Amino acid sequence: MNISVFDLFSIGIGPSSSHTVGPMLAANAFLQLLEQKNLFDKTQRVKVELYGSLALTGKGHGTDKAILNGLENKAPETVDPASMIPRMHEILDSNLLNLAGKKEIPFHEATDFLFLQKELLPKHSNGMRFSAFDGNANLLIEQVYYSIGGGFITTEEDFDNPPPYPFATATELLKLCKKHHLTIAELMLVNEKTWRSTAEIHKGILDIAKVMDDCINNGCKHDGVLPGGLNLKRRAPDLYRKLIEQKGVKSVFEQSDIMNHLNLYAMAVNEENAAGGRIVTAPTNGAAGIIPAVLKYCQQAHDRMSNEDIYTYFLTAAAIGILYKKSGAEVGCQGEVGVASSMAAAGLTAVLGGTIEQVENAAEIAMEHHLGMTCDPVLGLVQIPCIERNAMGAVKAVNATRMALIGDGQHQISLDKVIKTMKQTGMDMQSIYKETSMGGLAVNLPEC
Amino acid sequence: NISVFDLFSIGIGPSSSHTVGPMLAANAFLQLLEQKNLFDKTQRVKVELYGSLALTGKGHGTDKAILNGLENKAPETVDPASMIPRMHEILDSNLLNLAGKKEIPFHEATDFLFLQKELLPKHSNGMRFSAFDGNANLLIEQVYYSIGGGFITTEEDFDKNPPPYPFATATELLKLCKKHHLTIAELMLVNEKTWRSTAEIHKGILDIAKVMDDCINNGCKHDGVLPGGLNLKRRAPDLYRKLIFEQSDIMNHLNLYAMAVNEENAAGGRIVTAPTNGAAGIIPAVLKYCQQAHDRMSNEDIYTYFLTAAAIGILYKKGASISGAEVGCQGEVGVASSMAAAGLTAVLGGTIEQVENAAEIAMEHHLGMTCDPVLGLVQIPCIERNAMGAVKAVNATRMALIGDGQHQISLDKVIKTMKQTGMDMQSIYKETSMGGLAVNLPEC
Ligand code: SF4
Ligand code: SF4
Ligand SMILES: [Cl-]
Ligand SMILES: [Cl-]
């Protein structure tokens, strides 16, 4: 298996890769299967069934909203986030769905959109079935999809091009860099060029950077109360006014320093995510705050930041991502926010001039400081503790960087060891369950 | 029952369990020889180190500590600079100046044993002091266990009066504060007056702070390479000169102060537990940042800091059996961070709820953290964990305050998860080269 920077960082929408983006793509792919199989013209009814962990937290994650819009051919990277709620409301009030954006058809939630919290499909807990029927109520087709993380999906029947410098461990990564006289980012570039041209790769990285920067500004401006039931006030816009626009009275805890700026940038992004705005996974929507907050700090700190520093930051980040990833890859929040902090740490460190060993050392400290972190967020939403974790995660990633540079790389433990610990604490998590009000499921599976 | 002064005790580094404890055991063994009036007849003392105490005692200077402690040096007061030379003289001259009074022969090959492969039955950090007469007859032997924080217990006492507002949970501490109309600091002062007077509590807190402040200063000056064999260079001095990636900001100062302290600890300097020697850098680092970023802190603020910190520490410690309390580094570095966030939060004017929320977040960002340091020394990853720990405490404080307390999970639930990850660590073993014992038992 080959993993790309563009697998780790993808443009979609919030609040959840597993529960928002994946089901929206599964819906898009259901439309395509109707075409493939020549059943679209006969189809006069669609039915959606959500199982297990999709059904239990789907409402708070906008799974229904994502799927309904996706059935009209809205894609998560391009849909207008502001349209999702009004459009969903229109479909349900009017009992009509514009299937594939080509054909209106009747749609009744009582029979057509079911939440089966107490049933499971057997490959994975994030399961759904789509069904289409003719005007005579005959079943034309059914298809089960699993949302397996990051917004990737598979069919039930699919559930179970080599680059020049492939690597599976931290140790093999250093060994290859040494032997070919490359940085971590340079080695990555060579690998990414197996699948794309240098100009695709470079353009893809700046697009990601631009969307992150817009999401930060959107977060800084959108006052509001988050949905889903915690009445969680968005904090980033007031904090923006205090620290950037010199309005209102700074509290004793609201000083304008490096840390509260990391806080501002991360919370802005994760607040957008929770609200359903455009988001770049990094590597998931839940962990999305950390990488841009850090990149943005890096920008405000050295305004001679070049395009090549930006490439290096992303490719270095990607490399570390790969170490951790390369479907029972579910290891709790450490495999998301943890991996985001480690990636960001490694990127900043490479850009600030660390050796190969210091880049790993930095990643290692950042991860160390998340080992064991589970996913049991309050009511199922990507809000508490998720939002405070990205802030906390941005700050840890900068400090891990500082430890690795100030420490001259001395304060280090093998990154391969820290990855082994991630994987074992992750397995142990299969036996720790949420409250049976949250459905009594294991805490190794990310909600985001 | 637990006192602010139980968690913050003046001593010497690198380790509460391996250096301060065994020193107080020797001190106690001398007092047992006075008490049973066997000191006159004593011509030989013999020390045997067992288990996890032997495994890493050399790196933790347990030998140095025990030999100075057999001369009635005490961890609170010894000149730390006198520990190494004085041990060399004892071993080079084959002569132990017992209790400072009487000079006896001392032969390390028979009288100082490291028994790495054997265990005493109660606990892994156990020792035995024996005294013998001129004819090689046992006068008396006494097993001690060093069970954390520098506390000791004899073998017979191992398996074994109350304040007005006792609390065992985060929840109780809130109920009592609302009911009786008191901040956490004020309820703590009330509880602490059970054993001391106000002016002792107050003077004792101020003494702790002074030693912490001197400890930071010392670390900011003492250039060097740390002992034990990782050739770990001290970074606090350069950093201090540079702040007078090297940005001179809130973060690099927290780093500076925490590393100053933990480097002093690793080098064997004077150190105040908080709650352990290995976790020593966090609380002072946060206190100094607090002092530097607002008005000259009043003495009351300082009282509020330490007493608010201590209540959080008690939530973690209370009602725990000696083995239950062993929950890896989260139980030491984690607890310091949580304690420091809580104290900073109360000084800065947070509600009871926000003080609890900040403690909660700080501990959350340490859950499952094990004790498995490199070669067994209190260096790696111990030093970066205190820098990191000070940073998370301040930031946990911000989260609680900027979030107006909304970003909260119950502290009781985080405290419980601490315990079960702790329990699970009993089956996670260090490498065979470090002795194969579990990673839940703090080395520091
Ligand atoms: S908690 Fe679960 S959901 Fe919230 S961020 Fe960590 S992983 Fe994503
Ligand atoms: S690692 Fe073990 S020794 Fe180093 S601090 Fe944490 S607990 Fe104390
Ligand atoms: Cl059901
Ligand atoms: Cl994708």
3-state SS, chain A, equals CCCCHHHHCCEEECCCHHHHHHHHHHHHHHHHHHHHHCCCCCCCEEEEEEEHHHHHHCCCCCHHHHHHHHCCCCCCCCCCHHHHHHHHHHHHHCCEEEECCCEEEECCHHHHEEEECCCCCCCCCEEEEEEEECCCCCEEEEEEEEEEECCEEEECCCCCCCCCCCCCCHHHHHHHHHHHCCCHHHHHHHHHCCCCCHHHHHHHHHHHHHHHHHHHHHHHHCCCECCCCCCCECCHHHHHHHHCCCCCCCCCCCCCCHHHHHHHHHHHHHHHHHHCCEEECCCCCCCCCHHHHHHHHHHHHCCCCCHHHHHHHHHHHHHHHHHHHCCCCCCCHHHCHHHHHHHHHHHHHHHCCCCHHHHHHHHHHHHHCCCCCCCCCHHHCCCCCHHHHHHHHHHHHHHHHHHHHHCCCCCCCCHHHHHHHHHHHHHHHHHCECCCCCCCCECCCCCC
Torsion, Cα of A304, A306, A312, A314 (10° steps) = 100
Nearest partner of B89 among B67, B73, B109, judged by Cα = B67
- Tell me how far apart the alpha carbons of residues B330 and B309 are, in angstroms, rounded to a whole number: 16
Pairing of strands B44-50, A152-155: unpaired
What sign does the CA torsion over A327, A331, A336, A338 have? negative
- Tell me how far apart the alpha carbons of residues B441 and B425 are, in angstroms, rounded to a whole number: 9
Compute and round to an integer the Cα radius of gyration of chain A: 22
Considering CB atoms only, which of B245, B251, B388 is closest to A259?
B251
Torsion, Cα of A275, A276, A278, A281 (10° steps) = 90
- Tell me how far apart the alpha carbons of residues A244 and A121 are, in angstroms, rounded to a whole number: 50
* Token pair belonging to A430: 């299969």
- Tell me how far apart the alpha carbons of residues A337 and A385 are, in angstroms, rounded to a whole number: 11
- List of chain B residues whose C-beta atoms are within 8 Å of the C-beta of residue A392: 361, 365, 392, 395-396, 399
Q: Which atom of ligand 1 is nearest to the CA of A284?
A: 8
- Tell me how far apart the alpha carbons of residues A109 and A103 are, in angstroms, rounded to a whole number: 18
Contacts of A162 (CB under 8 A, 6+ apart): A2, A194
Residue B127 has phi, psi (to 5 degrees) of -130, 160
B183: helix, strand or coil: coil
Residue A47 has phi, psi (to 5 degrees) of -130, 140
- Tell me how far apart the alpha carbons of residues B100 and A345 are, in angstroms, rounded to a whole number: 54
B270: helix, strand or coil: strand
Ligand nearest to the CA of A50: 3
Ligand nearest to the CA of B327: 2
In the reported structure, the alpha carbon of residue A332 is separated from the centroid of ligand 3 by a whole-number distance in angstroms of 26
Q: Name the residue of B262, B332, B338 whose CB sits within 8 Å of the most ligand 2 atoms, as the mutation to test its pocket.
A: B332
Please state the domain extents for chain A.
2-160, 161-448
Nearest partner of A50 among A115, A104, A133, judged by Cα = A115
Could A253 and B403 be called an inter-chain contact, meaning their C-beta atoms sit closer than 8 Å? Answer: no
Contacts of A335 (CB under 8 A, 6+ apart): A324, A329, A422, A426, A446
Best of B375, B392, B406 to mutate (most A CBs within 10 Å, chain A):
B406
- Tell me how far apart the alpha carbons of residues B390 and B404 are, in angstroms, rounded to a whole number: 21
Q: Are B21 and B146 in contact (CB under 8 A)?
A: yes
Cis amide linkage into residue A23, ω under 30° from 0: no
* Token pair belonging to B55: 């495994």
**Class in CATH terms, B1-160:** alpha beta
Q: Name the residue of B226, B329, B366 whose CB sits within 8 Å of the most ligand 2 atoms, as the mutation to test its pocket.
A: B329
Crossing angle for the helix pair A198-221 and A307-325, nearest 10 degrees?
Answer: 90
Considering CB atoms only, which of A254, A257, A405 is closest to B250?
A257
Enumerate the β-bridge partners of residue B233: B225
Position of tokens 């502001």? A82
Distance, C-alpha B257 to centroid of its chain: 17
B134 burial type by CB count under 10 A (0-12 exposed, 13-18 middle, 19+ buried): exposed
B85 burial type by CB count under 10 A (0-12 exposed, 13-18 middle, 19+ buried): exposed
Q: Name the residue of A53, A337, A381 whose CB sits within 8 Å of the most ligand 1 atoms, as the mutation to test its pocket.
A: A337
A147 burial type by CB count under 10 A (0-12 exposed, 13-18 middle, 19+ buried): buried
Crossing angle for the helix pair A258-275 and A386-406, nearest 10 degrees?
Answer: 140
Any idea how long chain A is?
A: 448
**C-alpha angle with apex A268: A203 to A282, nearest 5 degrees?**
45
Q: Which atom of ligand 1 is nearest to the CA of A375?
A: 2
- Tell me how far apart the alpha carbons of residues B129 and B119 are, in angstroms, rounded to a whole number: 15
- Tell me how far apart the alpha carbons of residues A129 and A49 are, in angstroms, rounded to a whole number: 5
Enumerate the β-bridge partners of residue A144: A129
In the reported structure, the alpha carbon of residue A91 is separated from the centroid of ligand 4 by a whole-number distance in angstroms of 26
- Tell me how far apart the alpha carbons of residues A212 and A205 are, in angstroms, rounded to a whole number: 11
Considering CB atoms only, which of A252, A369, A405 is closest to B388?
A369
Pairing of strands A139-149, A152-155: antiparallel
Cis amide linkage into residue A227, ω under 30° from 0: no
Ligand nearest to the CA of A149: 4
- Is any ligand 1 atom within 6 A of the Cβ of residue A333? yes
Residue A140 has phi, psi (to 5 degrees) of -80, -45
Half-sphere exposure of B217 (CA within 13 A, CB side): 6
Q: Which amino acid would we find at residue A175?
A: K
- Tell me how far apart the alpha carbons of residues A92 and A113 are, in angstroms, rounded to a whole number: 11
- Shortest distance between the Cα of B403 and any Cα of chain A, in A, equals 7
B259: helix, strand or coil: helix
Considering CB atoms only, which of B294, B381, B398 is closest to A368?
B381
Q: Which residue of A has its CA nearest to B398?
A: A253
What sign does the CA torsion over B345, B347, B349, B351 have? positive
- Shortest distance between the Cα of A135 and any Cα of chain B, in A, equals 50
Please state the CATH superfamily assignment of the domain spanning residues A2-160 in this structure: D-3-phosphoglycerate dehydrogenase; domain 3 (3.30.1330.90)
Nearest partner of B330 among B417, B431, B428, B437, judged by Cα = B417
Residue B407 vs residues A166, A337, A361, A383, B196: alpha-carbon distances, Å? 42, 17, 31, 8, 38
In the reported structure, the alpha carbon of residue B210 is separated from the centroid of ligand 1 by a whole-number distance in angstroms of 42
Enumerate the β-bridge partners of residue A48: A113, A130
Documented resolution in Å: 2.2
- Tell me how far apart the alpha carbons of residues A213 and B64 are, in angstroms, rounded to a whole number: 57
DSSP for residue B368: T
A164 burial type by CB count under 10 A (0-12 exposed, 13-18 middle, 19+ buried): exposed
Q: Does B246 touch chain A (CB under 8 A)?
A: yes
CB atoms within 10 A of CB A200: 13
- Tell me how far apart the alpha carbons of residues B163 and B196 are, in angstroms, rounded to a whole number: 11
Q: Does A342 touch chain B (CB under 8 A)?
A: no
In the reported structure, the alpha carbon of residue A397 is separated from the centroid of ligand 4 by a whole-number distance in angstroms of 25
- Tell me how far apart the alpha carbons of residues B358 and B347 are, in angstroms, rounded to a whole number: 12
B145: helix, strand or coil: strand
- Tell me how far apart the alpha carbons of residues B88 and B94 are, in angstroms, rounded to a whole number: 10
